[PDB]
């Protein structure tokens, strides 16, 4: 089975967030659910175990729960502190497996939110004349530092040839990222348009280029 989490969550100091974790196959109550905190560059810490239990040294701001209704486990953090900013992973046991959730990025807001600025470059003719073609999608000035990037050839979602960086903190404390789509010159010229779609806090910026414009 899979454990599905929201990609990212953000809130201000002092407030309260909840990260959910949905089991795809089988009962959520069937097996114990654990939660791990992972700060940047750090190994994970157990923050909740056996559904709702706190290990010693974890504050009672952290609380776990189970909802059989939606086959969901949830992690709740009251009175957010700066040190709570981390990635949070749920995990459970299977008939003999060990499944981790995809993880959830928790940002403790320290500045106003900021939408990404997106600039999409078509393949240069220099590259096209060397039998190569790369679409460059530059994303910058966004906060929190959590985006998902998708691509489209005309109206179809592109399923191969996509390389995307994780967000990197720039000097103004916002974040930058990059996505690349590789094509052959024949593929580039045989489509009316290509699109880079950047989703940030539930909203999307799409930039399009075309071989003819």
């Amino acid at each position: 089975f899979m454990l599905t989490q929201p990609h990212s969550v953000s809130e201000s100091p002092g407030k309260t967030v909840t990260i959910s974790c949905t089991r795809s196959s089988g009962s959520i109550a069937s097996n114990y659910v654990q939660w791990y905190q992972q700060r940047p560059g750090s190994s994970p810490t157990t923050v909740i175990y056996e559904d709702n239990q706190r290990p010693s040294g974890v504050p009672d701001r952290f609380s776990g729960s189970i909802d059989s209704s939606s086959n969901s486990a949830s992690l709740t953090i009251s009175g957010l502190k700066t040190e709570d900013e981390a990635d949070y992973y749920c995990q459970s046991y299977d008939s003999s497996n060990q499944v981790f959730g995809g993880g959830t990025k928790l940002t403790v807001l320290g500045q106003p939110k900021a939408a990404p600025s997106v600039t999409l470059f078509p393949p240069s003719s220099e590259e096209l004349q060397a039998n190569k073609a790369t679409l460059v999608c530059l994303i910058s000035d966004f906060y929190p530092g959590a985006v998902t990037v998708a691509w489209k050839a005309d109206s179809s979602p592109v399923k191969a040839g996509v390389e995307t960086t994780t967000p990197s903190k720039q000097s103004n404390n916002k974040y930058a990222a990059s996505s690349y789509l590789s094509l052959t010159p024949e593929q580039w010229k045989s489509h009316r348009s290509y699109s880079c779609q950047v989703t940030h806090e539930g909203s999307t910026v799409e930039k399009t280029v075309a071989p003819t414009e």
Partner: protein, 215 residues
Amino acid sequence: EVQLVESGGGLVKPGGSLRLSCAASGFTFSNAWMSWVRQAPGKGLEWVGRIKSKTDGGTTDYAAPVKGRFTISRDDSKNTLYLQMNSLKTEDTAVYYCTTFDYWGQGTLVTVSSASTKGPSVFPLAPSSKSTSGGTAALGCLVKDYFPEPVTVSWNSGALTSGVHTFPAVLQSSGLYSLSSVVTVPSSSLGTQTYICNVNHKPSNTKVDKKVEPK
């Protein structure tokens, strides 16, 4: 009091071997179930496998991506857990944690790459009217297919620094790096000003000066 000291791991070609070891203190390692968990750069936690205490039979379980290729064993007289990595793929590149999953080691990095030193290809990202928002034009340089890191990018021999943004490199499925540097300038100076990116890739003793011209 609990300690999990990982060791082993580094670079390796695809198809090679590596043995990781996890030294434990602060708990009776013999009576303990031990697991390996890995995390690819910028990705999530993925369970690798578990070995059970020799009291409980000491048999091993494995995640599907490592079945037939990775072997987990234990020398619980020496309080050491092992991960024998055979038939390494580039997809195995990750930090590897040993766990007991309440307690976690600090992890060792295993990088599987067939790449060797290669200078970059530099292409201009020419300003058009489809790079211009307001009266500001975006122009840049694409720094393609190099290895290893790092690459340095300046503009006009460092005389142009305002509005310059060099983006961290992406690591491609091929094992090579790509990188972009972009600078925003007044569109009214595209006809009056020359823009050149200076790309320095010291590992290959390559430097490229690429003129970027309007379309």
